[PDB]
Amino acid sequence: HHHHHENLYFQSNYDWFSEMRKKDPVYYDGNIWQVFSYRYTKEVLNNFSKFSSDLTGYHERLEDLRNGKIRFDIPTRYTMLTSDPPLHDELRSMSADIFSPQKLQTLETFIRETTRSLLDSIDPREDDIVKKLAVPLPIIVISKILGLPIEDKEKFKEWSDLVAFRWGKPGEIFELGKKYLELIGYVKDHLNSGTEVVSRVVNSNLSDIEKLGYIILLLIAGNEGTTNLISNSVIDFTRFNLWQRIREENLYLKAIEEALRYSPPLMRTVRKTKERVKLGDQTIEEGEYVRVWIASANRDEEVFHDGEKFIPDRNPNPHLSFGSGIHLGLGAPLARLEARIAIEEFSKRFRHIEILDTEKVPNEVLNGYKRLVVRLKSN
């Protein structure tokens, strides 16, 4: 009954994950269950009837929402990501069709041209790729897809970091307001110019708060994840000296996937148990929180042979960086496409890459870089 491990100073998160995978893969720390193995992680993610994503009370509050009655709650609490069927299926079905192969094939040119434009702005002597490429690309592309014209990309970055960081925090809308009220004003002022998916959401039976949460989810959530995928890929391909090989062997799709496995932008996700469940050899009581470590599962030697090595052509690569089951990332194809095109165009342009300075995104759940300063050789 209750037992503590924990990452200690001399160890490093992946060494701790390796230990937990070997010694204690389903672990109660006295407060929350932590899961580290591929087998049990996937099990938790796929068994939504027992491990719930309703962690925000979306379901408990739905009526006080569809009949109108709450007014200063945080919208990102009420999205498809924090709901269970049948509400989840209803919400997701409004947009499943948006990232279809045909539409992304029609956006390849826009994305490629945008990427080239962003690359045109990099100083090869010294520059921050996170600032010049990784951040602006997903904001511009998602803006095109949803039809929300984005004037000041920097205000938008601020709003995206503000909302993403504090996602699901039970609180009052005033908590911030200085940046957040501006974001809300923007979405209402631009709820007309919108693309088919946005119009479907506004003209629906969702409460106004659900409508905002849904639009914010699509517009802002994927931005930090895709930025971090791109920057993590740049670091990994440089650290492991893979740029030449990736180019000569056309490894872009496989190498980007290995970046997703090895350096997942999202490290963990959470479920709440609805009933007593057996998970492995452990019994977890109704109402407990389960933290699933995608980063650990993605290195499990039972699934990924030689899992601690970066293998740019690893195949199969059944990583969990986009999740598994009914909540499998809606935006996964778009994230992959933006990252593949970005890495492709960048690799075409610069032949010698030297990393000069890095600053990490400070937080144990998200994995990426606030700053990535590099030197480039043209030709």
Closer Cβ to Ni ion, 32 or 356, answer by number? 32
Type of residue at 374? V
Closer Cβ to Ni ion, 34 or 226, answer by number? 34
Token pair 């994840």 is found at 225
Work out how close the CB of 304 gets to Ni ion at its nearest, in angstroms, rounded to a whole number: 33
Work out how close the CB of 4 gets to Ni ion at its nearest, in angstroms, rounded to a whole number: 6
Work out how close the CB of 27 gets to Ni ion at its nearest, in angstroms, rounded to a whole number: 13
Closer Cβ to Ni ion, 30 or 362, answer by number? 30
Work out how close the CB of 133 gets to Ni ion at its nearest, in angstroms, rounded to a whole number: 46
Residue closest to Ni ion when measured from CB atoms: 30
Closer Cβ to Ni ion, 27 or 51, answer by number? 27
Stretch that binds Ni ion, among 24-32, 76-84, 86-94, 339-347 (CB under 5 A): 24-32
Contacts of 6 (CB under 8 A, 6+ apart): 16, 29
Work out how close the CB of 35 gets to Ni ion at its nearest, in angstroms, rounded to a whole number: 19
Work out how close the CB of 180 gets to Ni ion at its nearest, in angstroms, rounded to a whole number: 38
Is residue 146 within a helix (H) or strand (E), and if so which, with residue range?
helix 136-146
Using CB under 5 A as the binding criterion, the count of chain residues that bind Ni ion stands at 1
Closer Cβ to Ni ion, 30 or 86, answer by number? 30
Work out how close the CB of 307 gets to Ni ion at its nearest, in angstroms, rounded to a whole number: 31
Closer Cβ to Ni ion, 6 or 359, answer by number? 6
Among 330, 362, 259, CA closest to 104: 330
Q: Residue 226 corresponds to which tokens in the numbers above?
A: 């895709």
How far is it, in rounded angstroms, from Cα 128 to Cα 126? 7
41 backbone φψ class: left, alpha, beta (φ>0; ψ -120 to 50): alpha
Work out how close the CB of 32 gets to Ni ion at its nearest, in angstroms, rounded to a whole number: 13
Cα 191 → chain centroid: 25
Stretch that binds Ni ion, among 22-30, 84-92, 188-196, 318-326 (CB under 5 A): 22-30
Closer Cβ to Ni ion, 3 or 305, answer by number? 3
Closer Cβ to Ni ion, 23 or 169, answer by number? 23
Q: Build a one-symbol-per-residue string for 26-45: x at contacts with Ni ion by CB under 5 A, - elsewhere.
A: ----x---------------
Binding region for Ni ion (CB under 5 A): 30
